[PDB]
Design a protein around this ligand. Structure first.
Ligand code: W5D
Length: 167
């Protein structure tokens, strides 16, 4: 039993809910919240800027120190950093930004990072500014992640479309 409430069960391991991932993290304080990161961990907008804003910029301060030591992530890669006031840990995962020419095949590699964590609260990857179509992202998620993932999807029109179109 875990603390996640109001989710629709899609599969044995994948759950979905119309809720801001920021709002949800504050309420649940999960072990792991996933950030929709870029390779520079520059949290300017969307999931990352909203998560970072909710940490009063402490996520960005920690992230800048990480990059100064380690250099950029890979597209499809991840790192584990603090969850600050939102979660124990934040798994920063870089999905394929299609508007920068980043191979559509890399979304599966991105979701494979989730398998290193038994339970996660997560954004659909490569939605919004990444230039990808969310129905595809949910399919790859379901076909790739084997651990227990709670997808906070903050677009009802999109939530309802994802549910209604789910095979
Ligand atoms: C969950 N998913 C989020 N997505 C879903 C909406 C599609 C993306 C639009 O760019 C944010 C993307 C957000 C954003 C702020 N909070 C969130 N929580």
């Amino acid at each position: 039993v875990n603390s996640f409430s109001g989710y629709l069960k899609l599969t044995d391991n994948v759950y979905i809910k119309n809720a801001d991932i920021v709002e949800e993290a504050k309420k649940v304080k999960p072990t792991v919240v996933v950030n929709a990161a870029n390779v520079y961990l520059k949290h300017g907008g969307g999931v990352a800027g909203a998560l970072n804003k909710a940490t009063n910029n402490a996520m960005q301060v920690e992230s800048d120190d990480y990059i100064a030591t380690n250099g950029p992530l890979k597209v499809g890669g991840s790192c584990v950093l603090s969850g600050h006031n939102l979660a124990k840990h934040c798994l920063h995962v870089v999905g394929p930004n299609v508007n920068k020419g980043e191979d559509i095949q890399l979304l599966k590699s991105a979701y494979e990072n989730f398998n290193q964590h038994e339970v996660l609260l997560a954004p659909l990857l490569s939605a919004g500014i990444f230039g990808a179509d969310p129905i595809h992202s949910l399919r790859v998620c379901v076909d790739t992640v084997r651990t227990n993932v709670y997808l906070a999807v903050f677009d009802k029109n999109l939530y309802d479309k994802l549910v209604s179109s789910f095979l």
